[PDB]
Design a protein around this motif. Structure first.
Motif, PDB file in Angstrom:
ATOM      1  N   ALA A  32       0.811  -1.218   0.000  1.00 38.50           N
ATOM      2  CA  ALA A  32       0.000   0.000   0.000  1.00 38.50           C
ATOM      3  C   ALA A  32       0.842   1.265   0.000  1.00 38.50           C
ATOM      4  O   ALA A  32       2.070   1.211   0.118  1.00 38.50           O
ATOM      5  CB  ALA A  32      -0.916   0.077   1.228  1.00 38.50           C
ATOM      6  N   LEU A  33       0.171   2.406  -0.136  1.00 39.57           N
ATOM      7  CA  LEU A  33       0.560   3.656   0.520  1.00 39.57           C
ATOM      8  C   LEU A  33      -0.740   4.438   0.685  1.00 39.57           C
ATOM      9  O   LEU A  33      -1.149   5.184  -0.207  1.00 39.57           O
ATOM     10  CB  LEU A  33       1.596   4.452  -0.255  1.00 39.57           C
ATOM     11  CG  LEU A  33       3.021   4.446   0.278  1.00 39.57           C
ATOM     12  CD1 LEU A  33       3.820   5.495  -0.461  1.00 39.57           C
ATOM     13  CD2 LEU A  33       3.035   4.703   1.772  1.00 39.57           C
ATOM     14  N   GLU A  34      -1.381   4.253   1.830  1.00 43.69           N
ATOM     15  CA  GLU A  34      -2.752   4.707   2.005  1.00 43.69           C
ATOM     16  C   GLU A  34      -2.781   6.108   2.598  1.00 43.69           C
ATOM     17  O   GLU A  34      -2.461   6.302   3.775  1.00 43.69           O
ATOM     18  CB  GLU A  34      -3.502   3.717   2.885  1.00 43.69           C
ATOM     19  CG  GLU A  34      -3.901   2.450   2.154  1.00 43.69           C
ATOM     20  CD  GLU A  34      -3.851   1.227   3.040  1.00 43.69           C
ATOM     21  OE1 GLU A  34      -2.886   1.104   3.818  1.00 43.69           O
ATOM     22  OE2 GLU A  34      -4.772   0.389   2.960  1.00 43.69           O
ATOM     23  N   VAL A  35      -3.173   7.084   1.786  1.00 44.04           N
ATOM     24  CA  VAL A  35      -3.097   8.491   2.150  1.00 44.04           C
ATOM     25  C   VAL A  35      -4.501   9.061   2.210  1.00 44.04           C
ATOM     26  O   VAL A  35      -5.211   9.079   1.199  1.00 44.04           O
ATOM     27  CB  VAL A  35      -2.250   9.293   1.148  1.00 44.04           C
ATOM     28  CG1 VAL A  35      -2.114  10.725   1.615  1.00 44.04           C
ATOM     29  CG2 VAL A  35      -0.895   8.651   0.968  1.00 44.04           C
TER      30      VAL A  35
END
Lengths: 48, 49
Positions: free
Chosen positions: B15-18
């Motif tokens: 992920a890279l959950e922003v």
């Protein structure tokens, strides 16, 4: 003889015996399966 | 199916959950073309529908 037939009998040659036929199973030898490159997945051990 | 599954398992990363909270009044004020104040335009457009 007086009639032209021979006194001594003829030779009887022996005929050839029937041979025994032979076969064979030649065999091959191919290589084994070599291991590919391992990739690390994202799931844990029971899932994978 | 096993081809597509193995490709998914090899190409799936985490992920890279922003989360980005966006206030629309800020965007309507910094519009740089017919920009406005949201709280006044809503009562203008409600009382004058």
């Amino acid at each position: 003889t007086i009639d032209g037939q021979p006194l001594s009998l003829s030779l009887y040659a022996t005929p050839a015996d029937p041979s025994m036929l032979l076969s064979a199973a030649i065999t091959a030898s191919q290589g084994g399966g070599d291991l590919p490159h391992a990739v690390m997945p994202m799931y844990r051990f029971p899932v994978i | 199916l096993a081809q597509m599954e193995k490709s998914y398992l090899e190409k799936d990363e985490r992920a890279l959950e922003v989360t980005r909270t966006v206030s629309l009044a800020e965007v309507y004020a910094g519009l740089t073309e017919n920009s406005f104040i949201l709280k006044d335009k809503v009562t203008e457009l409600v009382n004058a529908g």
